[PDB]
Structure formats: structure tokens, C-alpha cells
Design a protein around this ligand. Structure first.
Ligand SMILES: CCCCCc1sc(N)nc1C(=O)O
Ligand SMILES: [Zn+2]
Ligand SMILES: [Zn+2]
Length: 231
């Protein structure tokens, strides 16, 4: 069963196998007086691993590398952060120190530098416009336009029909927004629709926080974003 927030002490990381060569990583951390779970992705890349997003901070990300080495045993050689917040780049220095080459779009790297957060080393090109898609080893990166943030990317694993929505996609059980301080509540339902248009074949959808589901998470997220807007 997928691990839930109360089952992961802060400082520990779980790995969950979604498909052959595709895992999520689950960590926990505090934000604004409560502890929350957070998801990332791991994708087999030949004899190497591609990491999508940190485990939300340095200590969690060090434990992420430790669990990978113990359960999977292949090196993490590249990481992509899907937007500029600490649940996505917090830990990038640990990854750098351990030998991982880190990547994000130029906007993300600048919005993170601006904001005092850690900065991925390398700029992803070809994603500066809503609708853009680029290949990056075993995955596709896709910019849907602004949503949870203006820079947020989603990630698709063709091999497996896995869509990783990051923090632009909410889990089913979530009925209220926040954090929306950096969101575009205007563009957000549209960006969700662009995602629906590009990956209608998606069998597995991973939100940035919470339990995986199907493409129904896209419709559900739109409702929540709009319900917050009309209130
Ligand atoms: C649906 C979010 C639940 C809690 C709020 C938080 S905490 C964190 N690191 N990210 C978020 C986010 O909204 O993406
Ligand atoms: Zn965020
Ligand atoms: Zn988040």
C-alpha cells in the first residue's frame, strides 16, 4: 500500500514501485506548523537512474540517496527539479556533493536563486513556452503553462504511461488549496487542460503530494482550484 504521511518520520524516505524501472519517492517535512508528505520520481536510465525532484531538504535527500543505493543499487547521475520551491530543489547541494548533475529550466533556476533556495547547475532548454515538450533520457518534460507556479513542469514516462504532475496536480482526497502564494489561479485550469490534451494515454498520475490516481486527478484538481477562486 502507498505510504501515508503518518507512517514516514521526518528524515526517512520510502520508495514505491509504480512499474518496471519506475518508482516514486515519498518524504515528509514541516510547512507552516504541520508535516506533509511529498512525492518525487525515479526512472531507470540504462545502467543509471534519473531522479525527478529532491526529497524536500538536505537531510531527506541524503536519506533518499541512501535508500536508493540499498534497494536499487544503481547510481543517480542526473536530477531534474520541476519548480523552484524547497520540496523540489531543497537537497540539490547534497545531490551535487554526491556526484549528481542537476537540471532545471532557466526560469526555475532564476526563481530559486532570487528566493534564497538551492540552484540546479544546468539549464533545460526548449521549455520556455506553454505546450513545449523536450526529451530527457527515458522521460518527456512538458511545460503546461502557469499553475501551482509559473515555472512548473510535468514529467511523463512513455515506457509506462506514468504522468508525474508535481504540485500542479492535487490528490483526490484534497478539497482545499494552499499553498497558492505563487500560483496563477487564472491560467491553472487551462494548464490542466493542456496536460489532458498531451497525455490522454496516461494510466498512472502522481500528484506532488499524496496518493497516486488516474487522469481523474486532473479534473478534480481543476474543481479545487476553481472552488478556491469563487470564494
Ligand atoms: C496540496 C499541498 C498540501 C500542503 C501545502 C504544501 S507543503 C509543500 N512543500 N508543498 C505544498 C504544495 O501545495 O505544493
Ligand atoms: Zn511548490
Ligand atoms: Zn509542493
Amino acid at each position: 500500500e502507498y505510504p501515508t504521511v503518518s507512517e514516514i518520520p521526518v528524515g526517512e524516505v520510502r520508495l514505491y514501485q509504480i512499474a518496471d524501472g519506475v518508482w516514486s519517492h515519498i518524504a515528509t517535512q514541516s510547512f507552516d506548523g504541520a508535516v506533509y508528505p511529498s512525492n518525487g520520481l525515479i526512472v531507470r536510465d540504462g545502467d543509471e537512474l534519473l531522479l525527478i525532484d529532491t526529497a524536500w531538504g538536505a537531510k531527506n535527500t541524503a536519506a533518499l540517496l541512501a535508500e536508493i543505493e540499498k534497494q536499487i543499487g544503481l547510481p543517480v547521475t542526473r536530477a531534474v527539479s520541476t519548480h523552484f520551491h524547497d520540496d523540489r530543489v531543497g537537497g540539490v547541494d547534497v545531490l551535487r556533493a554526491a556526484g549528481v548533475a542537476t537540471y532545471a529550466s532557466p526560469s526555475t533556476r532564476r526563481l530559486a536563486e532570487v528566493e534564497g533556495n538551492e540552484i540546479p547547475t544546468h539549464s533545460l532548454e526548449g521549455l520556455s513556452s506553454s505546450g513545449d515538450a523536450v526529451r530527457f533520457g527515458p522521460v518527456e518534460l512538458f511545460y503546461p503553462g502557469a499553475a501551482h507556479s509559473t515555472d512548473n513542469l510535468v514529467v511523463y514516462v512513455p515506457s509506462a504511461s506514468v504522468l508525474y504532475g508535481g504540485c500542479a496536480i492535487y490528490e483526490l482526497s484534497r478539497t482545499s488549496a494552499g499553498n497558492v502564494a505563487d500560483a496563477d489561479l487564472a491560467e491553472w485550469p487551462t494548464s490542466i487542460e493542456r496536460i489532458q490534451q498531451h497525455y490522454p494515454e496516461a494510466q498512472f498520475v502522481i500528484p506532488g503530494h499524496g496518493l497516486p490516481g488516474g487522469l481523474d486527478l486532473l479534473k478534480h484538481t481543476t474543481n479545487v482550484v476553481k472552488a478556491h477562486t469563487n470564494r
